[PDB]
């Protein structure tokens, strides 16, 4: 059981996907700089899951409002 | 790796 | 016919929902400061419509490889 | 607005 890799403003947010950054107070960066480092889970055998609280399809509570899986973040008041 | 991926 | 208030570094990106700030070589932006300002569009009276090529559940493509609606961000290698 | 929001 691990979340995946570190991410974006100082290491704060963590990998939701590929190119999913997301964080507490940050937010979502879908496709942004910040994301790029998340491409190196899919180097890592373990597999890896971020967030804790399922939201959406197959999706984790990546940030205020906002859910994310692998390859998509959506607004979803239950976050 | 990200999990539905792996 | 316009595209919604501009955001995020240098009002380079454009807003596609509430919460979600998009740029060209910038990315997308779902939750974070840049698209605290794409909130203001709520206000204008005139419908607008970022983006230019359709995709997705009634999307745009935002930025490379990401599909955006007013309210979620998905990879779609056909952007 | 937001096109589906107007």
């Given at each position: ?19 999913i ?9 879908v496709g ?41 973040c ?6 | ?6």
């Amino acid at each position: 059981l691990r979340q995946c890799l570190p991410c974006g403003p100082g290491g704060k947010g963590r990998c939701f996907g590929p190119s999913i950054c997301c964080g507490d107070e940050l937010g979502c960066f879908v496709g942004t700089a910040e994301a790029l480092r998340c491409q190196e889970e899919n180097y890592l055998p373990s597999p890896c899951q971020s967030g804790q609280k399922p939201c959406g399809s197959g999706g984790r509570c990546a940030a205020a409002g906002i859910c994310c899986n692998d390859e998509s973040c959506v607004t979803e008041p239950e976050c | 790796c990200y999990f539905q991926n792996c």
